[PDB]
């Protein structure tokens, strides 16, 4: 169970990294919505990670 929990936590971290790259892309593309979505996703994931 601990290993499974760790894997889930690891997956969340990986997702956050992908989101960060997307946020950088949004700045280059000048799209407000893409940047906003990534930030929101990072926050919920962080909360989820803390719970985990």
């Amino acid at each position: 169970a601990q290993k499974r929990s760790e894997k889930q936590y690891n997956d969340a971290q990986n997702e956050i990294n992908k989101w960060q790259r997307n946020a950088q892309l949004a700045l280059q593309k000048g799209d407000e919505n893409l940047a906003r979505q990534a930030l929101e996703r990072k926050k919920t994931y962080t909360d989820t990670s803390a719970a985990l």
Binding site: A23, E32, A35, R36, E40
Partner: peptide, 11 residues
């Protein structure tokens, strides 16, 4: 968040 985005927008 919007305020933070504005700073990001310049870049």
């Amino acid at each position: 968040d919007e305020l933070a985005a504005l700073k990001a927008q310049m870049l």
